[PDB]
Design a protein around this ligand. Structure first.
Ligand code: CTP
Ligand code: CTP
Ligand code: CTP
Ligand code: ONL
Ligand code: ONL
Ligand code: ONL
Ligand code: ADE
Ligand code: ADE
Ligand code: ADE
Ligand code: MG
Ligand code: MG
Ligand code: MG
Lengths: 526, 526, 526
């Protein structure tokens, strides 16, 4: 039978709900259980594809081609269950489905109301997502006490009643502020948040308290007294330097044992050896390289969360501390190549639009002509090819049909325009003589795509003759996926997204090689 | 171990909470359990002795001398557990106790707050009241969602947590209104009341729905869905003609079985034979007499609730329907003796003050001179003696020192003034030649007193010579308790309160004889 | 006509409500208005005399002898209106008054309820406190959303309706937390607190936001949007180093102009010259002395708030930075005189009990024998006299009858025991040849007392012969109030409390002289 844990937040948002849910799922997975996580967003957007990177952050791509939130990236980094479209949906999706059915006439002339019909749709989606697992962690976005999240809370309360309270738990996150005047930690906001959740109709079973420091025992006893929660179920989660210590903290406080007691599960003791290994590797670097990431969404760092974490994972595998410096593309466009000095390696991540693309072309030129290690992802691969064709093959302002519709040299164009967006995991074939073959150590690889424009095969032969090699191709139309500069210490560009598959316990060959190249370059340049 | 049921009300007051609690206790007592009931009043009055009859109703006197509410009269009528001071207390009592302790210094210089100290006092009183019983029914006055009753609800929530939820139940009463426009019963007020109770921090276990008619099954299913309560625990209690059918209704709906399942009690099936006997006796009268009750608090009928019910009980024992007509004393004072015509018997209950006493004297005169059966209780006994002394013994305006401090003939006076209030049960000795001896059929009786002024023994010998007999006396000072007119079909006056001991299953000899005399008088006067 | 401002707090307590109310009253007083402040405490204690210093802090003594809270000390430091018993009362006081009246029978047999009677008592007290002033600031203790403060809020809502909304304002204090994760300030707790206050029935007119930093304009616009408050009435009050800058900040944000617009008051522009003078004096010290305060309540610094502020005020008058070091008396008792080294002056404040008194005697001995400046207040004066009598006059363990009832040498005793607590302001006569005469520069002074035991006049002549001089006496019994050591640079002890009369704009002669003596001692000892 399937057990459900519902995770909600109070007082303020931005408490770190996804990280805590991922850590708890990691602990449960370490005990041999089959767990999954699903995210509920109170957004009217049907999917985050329309959303821009400088509002919520990077868009995560699943194996099957769904576009989701950064939370699913967190979950895939923490557990070994592959996410899909069933692990994330919004309010807009539910309303669209119900409106479609009502227009089609599926409700047989009945009045379509919120409490029966909207909450029925929500419950159906939650059950279909959780089917086939031992434990399901359902995280509810928004703060408890807001108009936007009331249908979700009502649905989960009804679901808890229908399923049974011996298979459902409720977990509430709160903020315990610290006041420097009295020098104490205040428990009143938690009390009022529990009161609001009770007014909705849900009794918390576990209270997770978020604070700068650890919550004292007397404060936890007070919380237990005022919130109908047992004293053992008031769990403290202080701020940490590394998110990889959070499973250890929650395990030491006994959250896993309490959850297993309530759900009547007889699972062996948790083995957190891999997480301890990750902590040990992180705590003991032997070097320090600086990587320059040049992109257009520098203002909001969450636009590159997966890429930053993948660089960190590669550093962990190479036992090297990685220092990411963010460089704005328009700065390179106007100020020049001065900013790019003092960098052991350069990374150009993906993006949409023409703003800052010229700066990216300048950056690729500088890296290629200065033998600085370079990694290009999606848009970076395109700008690298454009720079190589223009300034090494003399294509006289070759560009992409994305930016200039008519430039007489469409090196990058839609597959139709060789003179719909590719989504999901695709298979790619690696050439035996290239760097990526020795990096992956496999004949073929599988990676995820979120692009529209491709590399023009008609103009590809000339650029190949100029010296640029192709390291990977698709399955049917032999679309170019990986390119490489031969006369370079390390110069790899890829059409797909490798950051959506790196994990702190396994890493990724591409980023490990990139960081190793950066370390070797700094040792050479010292 | 002791189990606790906490009974609260919502939407509106005056739902009949005490009757429902008494009926449930009756059902539990019919299964062989040791139950008790306690009442919590949100009043600032320390005790109802200061309160006037035309605000809340008659004052109930326990065996030990406590003054309480009408609810304790209900409870003593429904169960066979004697009440005391431990079964009723107010907010004012708790605050007085805590203020006394704080002034005395018992709190050792700590700050006396509401949540720790007031609720600790409340919990201590509740535990001391409930000690030594199988089940304790704690009824909380006021509506849920009011300022006045928040300390009580907080205290009972904390008590439920401390004691354990396998020994505590919460029962909520609500109003299900009926709207004649749509012709339906509305469940929304119940939903909002349950939400308010949850906001306080209590989850109901049982919902009792009050309505003119029975609540339909679909409405109950809706209530169960919206209130986290199982569908079997939504109990309908419609308006009834007789409060004696309520235990049968609650038993038929399965409330007792659910309560016994939750508390893990193995008690035999309920035997409600006596209540069925009472219903059968009530439903089948053979006669119809009319009794005139003359008093000063006629405006509020709750000022004579116990006396009215005792007359009804006597009628049930005599298989006679009793029709109580209320006559205002000042009406007799001004309009005259015209109102008292067409009455088979006359009752004068107790009271305080001089307003209307002359009308009572007129009424006693009329009854004595017309051979109409007469019953006098406390003040009625005094006015009967005054009338007999004045208009048969020629005492020339003899009165009580209560009304006129100096009248030269103090037939009624304080024990000091023979030329502090007696409270509780006292023993009395019956004379062998009198009516009350054959009525009680016992050498001695025990009854309850709530009076200050007594009968003057110095002037008693003359009135005894005039013809009036004394039927009962006290133990030490031979205070007169019962008097009788010999040349009358039925003329009994008592100093105590016999209505505080009549029950529908046992009755009372005095009221049974009074009603029988009324029936005989009507048969004679045909 | 009298205008009322009601000040409440939300989210958490300890926001600094009294300081903000005092600053606003200071601004209004700077515009020529007649203002007063009153404090409402949700305590069951009738008065803080029973409370101990290590729970809430020092007890404030008014001119008329009332014992109050530290808030009244704040108010007297900020405005020039003398407080009294009418400026502070608790829940326990209101309940005691109502219980007394109900027992006495003043309510004529009616039921005494919370909403009519308790709130009527509260309103009567508030009106009697505010009568005769232009503006009244009523501060309500407790957080909005607690059981303990609901009667106060209901009373003030009813009062606002009765008086009129053109003479009543509501001011709400909230916490705007800062989250280091996102690096933003969160407005959600303020939104929920305003919702709770609205649920009680009060619409805020002004929102005062408390935070580490200043609240940004966009956040304030959001607060205005969500809370029905105009954008100009959302006032930011960040944490400050000096509480004397708070009136300037509130004045710069336009709170005074808004309040005067709402109340239709035409008062001249605020003149905050004196507060600017205080800030200038504080910001520019020329020296740095360290003062050792030795006492028994060192654990809670609020037990000496007035004394600490008075030392700071004296330093401001002497343009000297004052560094207060707290020394525990039992430390001196056990560890010895080692702790008292490196101190330019020593202060012994008052207290009750024998614990630590021996350490105080040791400290007085050390100061007297080392010519370190010494100030003694109440208990300190007693221990100084005990030390002088024992170790200079050889009284062989002379003590107070407070500690040892029978010691054969009662230098300190009750006025009866020469072989009830003095409260309020009393007049004292200064001797012309003493230090205090040149300090006060007046024949007589008026100060406040909170003591029981006095100096024995019978044994006083011997100690006077030994060398100790008496500098002040009472009016009728010539009770000793001030003593002095002649062969000392500065050694003054007083029976009264001079810290209850020092203000940052006027200071106090005694503490100014004490701090000047400390500076001279350090210059000598350098
Ligand atoms: N549900 C509650 C809980 C507390 N109190 C009252 O609130 C006061 C406590 O002050 P406060 O410090 O604000 O409460 P804490 O529980 O200590 O909250 P915090 O942890 O933030 O300090 C006490 O007098 C108590 O009677 C109340 O009225 N209602
Ligand atoms: N907690 C709830 C429950 C009901 N609904 C909505 O309220 C409407 C139902 O109307 P109403 O008759 O007032 O609700 P009932 O449950 O039928 O209440 P009642 O028994 O009084 O008729 C439905 O559209 C439903 O979506 C809601 O918004 N919130
Ligand atoms: N009364 C309100 C106000 C806000 N929202 C929703 O809450 C979300 C905003 O998230 P949050 O940051 O928590 O709200 P803020 O107003 O920005 O609160 P804060 O200042 O603490 O960040 C929005 O989607 C909005 O639709 C809501 O449902 N009910
Ligand atoms: C994948 C990405 O960053 C988009 C690049 C470009 N706009 C495209 O191919 O769609
Ligand atoms: C018992 C009663 O009705 C009071 C009667 C008279 N006032 C008395 O004796 O106190
Ligand atoms: C005023 C003070 O500190 C008390 C000192 C001593 N106990 C007394 O006189 O009461
Ligand atoms: N304990 C924690 N410390 C830091 N960031 C967090 N995000 C979620 N939980 C966290
Ligand atoms: N069901 C009911 N009918 C009439 N009066 C009542 N008082 C309490 N319950 C009642
Ligand atoms: N703004 C403020 N800074 C510091 N302490 C305070 N107490 C009250 N208001 C304050
Ligand atoms: Mg506290
Ligand atoms: Mg309906
Ligand atoms: Mg926000």
């Amino acid at each position: 039978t399937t057990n459900y844990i519902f995770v909600t937040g109070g007082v303020v948002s931005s408490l770190g709900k996804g990280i805590a849910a991922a850590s708890l799922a990691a602990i449960l997975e370490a005990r041999g259980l089959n767990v999954t996580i699903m995210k509920l967003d109170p957004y009217i957007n049907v999917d985050p594809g329309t959303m821009s990177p400088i509002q919520h952050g990077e868009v995560f791509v699943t194996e099957d081609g769904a576009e989701t939130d950064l939370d699913l990236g967190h979950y895939e980094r923490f557990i070994r269950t592959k996410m899909s479209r069933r692990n994330n949906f919004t309010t807009g999706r539910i309303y669209s489905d119900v409106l479609r059915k009502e227009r089609r006439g599926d409700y047989l002339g009945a009045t379509v109301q919120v409490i029966p019909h909207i909450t029925n749709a929500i419950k159906e989606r939650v059950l279909e997502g959780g089917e086939g697992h031992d434990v399901v962690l359902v995280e509810i976005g928004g703060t408890v006490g807001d108009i936007e999240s009331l249908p979700f809370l009502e649905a989960i309360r009804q679901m808890a009643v229908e399923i049974g309270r011996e298979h459902t738990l409720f977990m509430h996150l709160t903020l315990v502020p610290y006041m420097a005047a009295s020098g104490e930690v205040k428990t009143k906001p938690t009390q009022h948040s529990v009161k609001e959740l009770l007014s909705i109709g849900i009794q918390p079973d576990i209270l997770i308290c978020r604070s700068d420091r650890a919550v004292p025992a007397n404060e936890r006893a007070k919380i237990a007294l005022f919130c109908n929660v047992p004293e053992k179920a008031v769990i403290s989660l202080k701020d940490v330097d590394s998110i990889y210590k959070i499973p250890g903290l929650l395990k030491s406080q006994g959250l896993d044992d309490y959850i297993c007691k309530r759900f009547s599960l007889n699972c062996p003791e948790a083995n957190l050896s891999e997480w301890e290994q990750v902590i040990f590797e992180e705590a003991n670097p032997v070097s320090e390289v600086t990587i320059g990431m040049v992109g257009k969404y520098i203002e909001l760092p969450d636009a590159y969360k997966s890429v930053i974490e993948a660089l960190k994972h590669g550093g962990l595998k190479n036992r090297v501390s990685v220092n990411i410096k963010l460089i704005d593309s328009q700065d390179v466009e106007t100020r020049g190549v001065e900013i790019l000095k003092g960098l052991d390696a350069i990374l150009v991540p993906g993006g949409f639009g023409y703003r800052g693309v010229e700066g990216m072309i300048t950056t690729a030129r500088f890296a290629r002509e200065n033998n600085i290690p370079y990694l290009g992802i999606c848009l970076g691969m395109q700008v690298a090819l454009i720079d190589y064709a223009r300034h090494v093959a003399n294509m006289e302002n070759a560009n992409s049909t994305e930016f200039v519709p008519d430039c007489k040299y469409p090196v990058v164009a839609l597959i139709t325009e060789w003179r719909t967006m590719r989504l999901g995991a695709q298979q790619c074939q690696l050439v035996d003589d290239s760097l990526v073959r020795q990096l992956y150590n496999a004949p073929t690889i599988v990676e995820r795509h979120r692009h529209r424009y491709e590399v023009n095969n008609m103009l590809l032969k000339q650029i190949e003759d100029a010296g640029l090699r192709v390291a990977g191709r698709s399955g049917d139309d032999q679309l170019v996926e990986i390119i490489e500069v031969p006369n370079h210490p390390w110069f790899v560009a890829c059409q797909f997204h490798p950051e959506f598959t790196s994990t702190p316990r396994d890493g990724h060959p591409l980023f490990a090689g990139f960081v190793k190249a950066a370390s070797e370059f700094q040792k050479r340049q010292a």
